[PDB]
Write a protein that binds this DNA or RNA. Structure first.
Lengths: 96, 115, 88, 84
RNA sequence: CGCAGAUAUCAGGAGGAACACCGGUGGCGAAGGCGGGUCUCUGGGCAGUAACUGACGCUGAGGAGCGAAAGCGUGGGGAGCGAACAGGAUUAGAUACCCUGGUAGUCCACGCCGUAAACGGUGGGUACUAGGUGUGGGUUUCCUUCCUUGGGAUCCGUGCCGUAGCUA
């Protein structure tokens, strides 16, 4: 599979008590595709460069994956269609 | 009523000069310009117009109860610092300066050239 | 694109022996594979002209190799051709 | 003890000077990541804009890599871009 | 244009084109041309190893295909700019420069035409032919820290100066 590394930023209204399982509810779809290496970082409540929807901070997050193009695309689709996510951005670990 | 401390916006361009006092929130109290000072047409790019306009507006703000000012400048101005000297002559405390002339990130097409 | 896996497959089938690369048979086979895939790509992308130029170049060298092999031995020529399903 | 040039004394120096610099492989680096904004803030001005090669020293490789990282960072608001 | 409450200023939203600082005698593309970011699909070139076939090469009338912009058609969209066009002002007169406004068009999809100073005003392919100098990319050995426009050699591409030679 192809390696990828996803960023997500969230409103501070959520909490670290909710962060990881809330995302794993999505990522189970990928785990039932590849047995994919999920590996999360959480370093949040972090002030912003500039406000999005008048939010001074966000709950940053980094998600390392080894998966396939369709699965990353559908993940992105579900997340962006979610009510909670501010942003998401998708970058390939490999050479290109 | 009154406000003791607020902010000031200074728009100097090629063919006119104008100022406005305002709260940090955005609510004006008082403004002036070279047209109200009396000059007309083509004379009112000179820094002398800036002196007189800023002076009148600062005195209006002294009337409405201002003592200190934040200052924000904008645009091609021969008499920016001239207006600044006029303000600080008028009896007001210069809070903070910032040369925010609005630059775009290579956006809307500007007009053509002249000759 | 083409991977070592696919190339070794095609060279296992069409290669004279396990080393050959200059085999016109192998070369033609790989080019035709590449061209089939690229044509599938241009089904969707009708406008990737910068890729269509590569397509035409590959067709050129393909017909050159066929022309060589027909100059040499038409038996081998038509063997390869019937083996790949071309019309020429 | 020695001059910036006429280095007839040491080996060919593994050191950098005012014309020559490859500042990232030189020092100030963990790895080129849009995550590490404290490092990317070094290749800017206070007004947020970006430096040049005859200012910094980088090769175009590192320059363009870093600029792309910076720009992704401004997109994800990890870095204070110049604005209102 | 306002004096029916403008310009300015601030909070928000709607909206469509172009994407500063990187970025320039710098990279790619056969040519035209090509930069907001991310993903997908795909192509080309370079170097080294030089394992494989063993002259398969170069050119190319005719012919096919691509091809800046403006234009044309069906449809969509239309903030700014702006042919035409209206007015103002200069003017001897101004169907023109200047100012105010402003339609087609610029933009998207699908097709067309198929031209330009489409310029290096130098067709392509190839061998030898003094050098110096910057520069982009990849190899490699020595003072070797071996974290280096390191330095040297080499290969590819790219600019300046300059021998013989050549040219009215």
């Amino acid at each position: 599979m192809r390696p990828y590394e996803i960023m997500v930023i969230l409103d501070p209204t959520l909490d670290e008590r909710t962060v990881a399982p809330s995302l794993e509810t999505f990522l189970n779809v990928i785990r039932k595709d590849g047995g994919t290496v999920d590996k999360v970082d959480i370093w949040g409540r972090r002030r912003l460069a500039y406000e999005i929807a008048k939010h001074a901070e966000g709950i940053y997050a980094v998600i390392d994956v080894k998966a396939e193009p369709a699965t990353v695309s559908e993940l992105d689709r579900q997340l962006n269609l979610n009510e909670s996510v501010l942003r998401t951005k998708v970058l390939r670990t490999d050479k290109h | 009523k009154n406000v003791p401390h607020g902010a000031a916006h200074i728009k100097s361009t090629f063919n006119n000069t104008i100022v406005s006092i305002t709260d940090p929130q955005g609510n004006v109290i008082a403004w002036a310009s070279s047209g109200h000072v009396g000059f007309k047409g083509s004379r009112k790019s000179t820094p002398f117009a800036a002196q007189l306009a800023a002076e009148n507006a600062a005195r209006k703000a002294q009337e409405h109860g201002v003592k200190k000012v934040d200052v924000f400048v904008k645009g091609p101005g021969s008499g920016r610092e001239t207006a600044i000297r006029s303000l600080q002559a008028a009896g007001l405390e210069v809070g903070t300066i910032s040369d925010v002339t609005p630059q775009p990130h290579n956006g809307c097409r500007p007009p053509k050239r002249r000759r | 694109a083409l991977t070592a896996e696919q190339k070794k497959e095609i060279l296992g089938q069409y290669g004279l022996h396990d080393t050959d690369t200059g085999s016109p048979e192998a070369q033609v086979a790989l080019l035709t594979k590449r061209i089939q895939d690229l044509t599938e790509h241009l089904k969707v992308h009708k406008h990737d002209h910068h890729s269509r130029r590569g397509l035409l170049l590959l067709v050129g060298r393909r017909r050159r190799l066929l022309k060589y092999v027909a100059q040499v031995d038409v038996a081998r020529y038509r063997s390869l051709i019937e083996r790949l399903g071309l019309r020429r | 003890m020695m001059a910036v040039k006429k280095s007839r004394k040491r080996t060919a120096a593994t050191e950098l000077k005012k014309p020559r610099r490859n500042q990232l492989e030189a020092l100030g680096v963990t790895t080129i990541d849009y995550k590490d904004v404290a490092v990317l803030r070094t290749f800017l001005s206070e007004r947020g804009k970006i430096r040049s090669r005859h200012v910094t020293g980088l090769t175009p490789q590192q320059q363009r890599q870093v600029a792309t990282a910076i720009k992704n960072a401004r997109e994800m608001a990890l870095l204070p871009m110049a604005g209102p």
